[PDB]
Design a protein around this ligand. Structure first.
Ligand SMILES: Oc1c(Cl)cc(SC(F)(F)F)cc1SC(F)(F)F
Ligand SMILES: [Cl-]
Length: 134
């Protein structure tokens, strides 16, 4: 209980850096990168018992995942990858690992001041996406 209280709420994207390069490293094709890179998603996080739900809503896609920490699940990503995901809490940071086709990417979500900071890493390439409360 209360594990993720500081994450819960509705958040809006305010800045993004290096997302196109992250998407390239992931393998996202040109047209999807252009459209996805323009998106300004909201992220809606809620908790009910042990189940965490994260929704991303934008003009590009609406996606939703529900999960229990440490318990793998299958996810179709906004760019249409079919991945195996596991999300854990590490020292207050939500750590989301996606595995597919022998590849891996990790997305970390953390609270910093009044922001929710999302760091997406694929090999040597990081993108930082900053959200504020809606
Ligand atoms: O915020 C995103 C995150 Cl975390 C992931 C992905 S999937 C990718 F990176 F392959 F593009 C796309 C977006 S932009 C969207 F939310 F509008 F879909
Ligand atoms: Cl960017």
């Amino acid at each position: 209980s209360h594990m993720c209280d500081a994450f819960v709420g509705t958040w809006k994207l305010v800045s993004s850096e290096n997302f196109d390069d992250y998407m390239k490293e992931v393998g996202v094709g040109f047209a999807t990168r252009k459209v996805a890179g323009m998106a300004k998603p909201n992220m809606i996080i809620s908790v009910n018992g042990d189940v965490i739900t994260i929704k991303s809503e934008s003009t590009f896609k609406n996606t939703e995942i529900s999960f229990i920490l440490g318990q793998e699940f299958d996810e179709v990503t906004a760019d249409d990858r079919k991945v195996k995901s596991t999300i854990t809490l590490d020292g207050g940071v939500l750590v989301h690992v996606q595995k597919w086709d022998g590849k891996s990417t990790t997305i970390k979500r953390k609270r910093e001041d009044d922001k929710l900071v999302v760091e997406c890493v694929m090999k040597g390439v990081t993108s930082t996406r900053v959200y504020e409360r809606a």
